[PDB]
Design an enzyme around this catalytic site. Sequence first.
Site, PDB file in Angstrom:
ATOM      1  N   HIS A 146      31.462  -9.528  -5.185  1.00  0.00           N
ATOM      2  CA  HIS A 146      30.281  -8.721  -5.472  1.00  0.00           C
ATOM      3  C   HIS A 146      29.875  -8.004  -4.195  1.00  0.00           C
ATOM      4  O   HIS A 146      29.579  -6.811  -4.165  1.00  0.00           O
ATOM      5  CB  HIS A 146      29.161  -9.608  -6.028  1.00  0.00           C
ATOM      6  CG  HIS A 146      27.848  -8.929  -6.272  1.00  0.00           C
ATOM      7  ND1 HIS A 146      27.395  -8.591  -7.533  1.00  0.00           N
ATOM      8  CD2 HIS A 146      26.870  -8.517  -5.434  1.00  0.00           C
ATOM      9  CE1 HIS A 146      26.215  -8.003  -7.442  1.00  0.00           C
ATOM     10  NE2 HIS A 146      25.859  -7.936  -6.167  1.00  0.00           N
ATOM     11  N   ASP A 167      12.036  -5.119  -7.974  1.00  0.00           N
ATOM     12  CA  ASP A 167      13.489  -5.183  -7.816  1.00  0.00           C
ATOM     13  C   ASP A 167      14.093  -3.790  -7.703  1.00  0.00           C
ATOM     14  O   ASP A 167      15.110  -3.507  -8.337  1.00  0.00           O
ATOM     15  CB  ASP A 167      14.107  -5.898  -9.005  1.00  0.00           C
ATOM     16  CG  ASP A 167      15.585  -6.200  -8.935  1.00  0.00           C
ATOM     17  OD1 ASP A 167      16.115  -6.438  -7.833  1.00  0.00           O
ATOM     18  OD2 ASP A 167      16.234  -6.204 -10.007  1.00  0.00           O
ATOM     19  N   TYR A 224      20.295   2.754  -3.990  1.00  0.00           N
ATOM     20  CA  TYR A 224      19.912   1.458  -4.520  1.00  0.00           C
ATOM     21  C   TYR A 224      18.503   1.430  -5.090  1.00  0.00           C
ATOM     22  O   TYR A 224      17.654   0.677  -4.606  1.00  0.00           O
ATOM     23  CB  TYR A 224      20.021   0.396  -3.427  1.00  0.00           C
ATOM     24  CG  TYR A 224      20.362  -0.993  -3.912  1.00  0.00           C
ATOM     25  CD1 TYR A 224      21.510  -1.281  -4.632  1.00  0.00           C
ATOM     26  CD2 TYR A 224      19.499  -2.048  -3.622  1.00  0.00           C
ATOM     27  CE1 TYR A 224      21.793  -2.570  -5.060  1.00  0.00           C
ATOM     28  CE2 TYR A 224      19.765  -3.337  -4.036  1.00  0.00           C
ATOM     29  CZ  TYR A 224      20.916  -3.587  -4.754  1.00  0.00           C
ATOM     30  OH  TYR A 224      21.181  -4.870  -5.166  1.00  0.00           O
TER      31      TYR A 224
HETATM   32  N1  LIG Z   1      21.663  -6.657  -2.072  1.00  0.00           N
HETATM   33  C1  LIG Z   1      21.609  -8.083  -2.466  1.00  0.00           C
HETATM   34  C2  LIG Z   1      20.161  -8.261  -2.660  1.00  0.00           C
HETATM   35  C3  LIG Z   1      19.358  -8.135  -1.370  1.00  0.00           C
HETATM   36  C4  LIG Z   1      18.465  -7.102  -1.183  1.00  0.00           C
HETATM   37  C5  LIG Z   1      17.785  -6.973  -0.047  1.00  0.00           C
HETATM   38  C6  LIG Z   1      17.895  -7.905   0.965  1.00  0.00           C
HETATM   39  C7  LIG Z   1      18.756  -8.975   0.767  1.00  0.00           C
HETATM   40  C8  LIG Z   1      19.524  -9.127  -0.392  1.00  0.00           C
HETATM   41  P1  LIG Z   1      22.833  -8.426  -3.622  1.00  0.00           P
HETATM   42  O1  LIG Z   1      22.823  -7.643  -4.901  1.00  0.00           O
HETATM   43  O2  LIG Z   1      24.176  -8.263  -3.029  1.00  0.00           O
HETATM   44  C9  LIG Z   1      22.438 -10.113  -3.928  1.00  0.00           C
HETATM   45  C10 LIG Z   1      23.108 -10.753  -5.160  1.00  0.00           C
HETATM   46  C11 LIG Z   1      23.941 -11.967  -4.714  1.00  0.00           C
HETATM   47  C12 LIG Z   1      24.738 -12.656  -5.799  1.00  0.00           C
HETATM   48  C13 LIG Z   1      25.838 -12.044  -6.381  1.00  0.00           C
HETATM   49  C14 LIG Z   1      26.563 -12.667  -7.377  1.00  0.00           C
HETATM   50  C15 LIG Z   1      26.181 -13.930  -7.790  1.00  0.00           C
HETATM   51  C16 LIG Z   1      25.083 -14.551  -7.219  1.00  0.00           C
HETATM   52  C17 LIG Z   1      24.382 -13.932  -6.204  1.00  0.00           C
HETATM   53  C18 LIG Z   1      22.158 -11.126  -6.305  1.00  0.00           C
HETATM   54  O3  LIG Z   1      22.380 -10.854  -7.481  1.00  0.00           O
HETATM   55  N2  LIG Z   1      21.088 -11.786  -5.930  1.00  0.00           N
HETATM   56  C19 LIG Z   1      19.925 -12.290  -6.630  1.00  0.00           C
HETATM   57  C20 LIG Z   1      19.621 -13.653  -6.073  1.00  0.00           C
HETATM   58  C21 LIG Z   1      18.492 -14.538  -6.488  1.00  0.00           C
HETATM   59  C22 LIG Z   1      18.371 -14.995  -7.784  1.00  0.00           C
HETATM   60  C23 LIG Z   1      17.347 -15.835  -8.186  1.00  0.00           C
HETATM   61  C24 LIG Z   1      16.408 -16.226  -7.249  1.00  0.00           C
HETATM   62  C25 LIG Z   1      16.506 -15.774  -5.942  1.00  0.00           C
HETATM   63  C26 LIG Z   1      17.539 -14.941  -5.560  1.00  0.00           C
HETATM   64  C27 LIG Z   1      18.781 -11.301  -6.395  1.00  0.00           C
HETATM   65  O4  LIG Z   1      18.578 -10.908  -5.231  1.00  0.00           O
HETATM   66  O5  LIG Z   1      18.116 -10.929  -7.358  1.00  0.00           O
HETATM   67 ZN   LIG Z   2      24.380  -6.723  -5.477  1.00  0.00          ZN
END
Ligand SMILES: N[C@@H](Cc1ccccc1)P(=O)(O)C[C@@H](Cc1ccccc1)C(=O)N[C@@H](Cc1ccccc1)C(=O)O
Ligand SMILES: [Zn+2]
Length: 316
Positions: free
Chosen positions: A142, A226, A157
């Site tokens: 990802h 978001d 984004y």
């Molecule tokens: N740009 C990331 C978000 C970010 C923005 C700004 C600063 C820091 C991070 P990502 O999409 O790569 C993160 C991504 C990671 C992931 C991918 C695949 C599977 C699992 C996790 C993602 O979808 N993250 C969730 C994580 C999350 C879920 C539930 C609670 C807390 C955090 C989110 O940020 O929405």
């Molecule tokens: Zn992402």
Amino acid sequence: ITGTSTVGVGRGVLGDQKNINTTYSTYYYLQDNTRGDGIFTYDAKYRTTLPGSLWADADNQFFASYDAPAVDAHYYAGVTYDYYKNVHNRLSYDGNNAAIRSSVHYSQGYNNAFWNGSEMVYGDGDGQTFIPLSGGIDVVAHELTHAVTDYTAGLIYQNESGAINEAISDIFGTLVEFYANKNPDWEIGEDVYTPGISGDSLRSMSDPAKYGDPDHYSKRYTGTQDNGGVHINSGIINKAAYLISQGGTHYGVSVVGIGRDKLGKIFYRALTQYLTPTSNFSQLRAAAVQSATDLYGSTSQEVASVKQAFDAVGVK
Ligand SMILES: N[C@@H](Cc1ccccc1)P(=O)(O)C[C@@H](Cc1ccccc1)C(=O)N[C@@H](Cc1ccccc1)C(=O)O
Ligand SMILES: [Zn+2]
Ligand SMILES: [Ca+2]
Ligand SMILES: [Ca+2]
Ligand SMILES: [Ca+2]
Ligand SMILES: [Ca+2]
């Protein structure tokens, strides 16, 4: 580091043993010289300054608990590189074999991962919501796919372009998972999410609504959280991608599946040839249809399936 290429052994986040490409020069470093200009993994030591220190080990054995996230980040970056090269003929994320760098042990109890414009960053999780995020191959892919997108379409984004950006990362994350044949599924983050709960995941491509995300354009999120819902409205495109591959009837619309390999080929072409920084969902549909056309002809089944799938999720 300048040194001799060698191979170490360790155990990943999930306790699985694997071999890893290292470099020897006094210490053994998490530096893989066999792929492009290299894969480099760093220890951020629970701080937020980056990249931290190139990972060094005295005996080329990585069985310590502290070692696990480094092992998996290093190994899964390699697998992801192999996918793009072997399947799409792409040399690293910039197409010219750019060095791939990852830092692990970022901050304290950090429940996320990200690409910061220059490298990948993985937290260890809090041990309830997440375990160290590099243990999920769909997570790693990802993140590296965000790099590919940045260097290609450059989807901004926020709002629809940002949801496309997110969908692309979930889609190729899933395709890499299948590629590695590692307990593959159409779910996102299942290997590192909620270690106390079996059977769940962060997102679902097969049924986004299972975890509260929209599976139809009519149900899109229109607020400002978001970044205008990039991880939410991504469900609409994820469902579409799932249908193109696997087929199905969604809100009365029937889609014949054409399989994962063709899915990847069509979306890779769209991403690299037709999408722009400000593309919206409707433009993604146009790009996807044109790509399928390019590849398979305007009266092909593949083109037909792409159309049905977008119709099914309400994207014209
Ligand atoms: N740009 C990331 C978000 C970010 C923005 C700004 C600063 C820091 C991070 P990502 O999409 O790569 C993160 C991504 C990671 C992931 C991918 C695949 C599977 C699992 C996790 C993602 O979808 N993250 C969730 C994580 C999350 C879920 C539930 C609670 C807390 C955090 C989110 O940020 O929405
Ligand atoms: Zn992402
Ligand atoms: Ca060691
Ligand atoms: Ca899986
Ligand atoms: Ca998965
Ligand atoms: Ca779980």
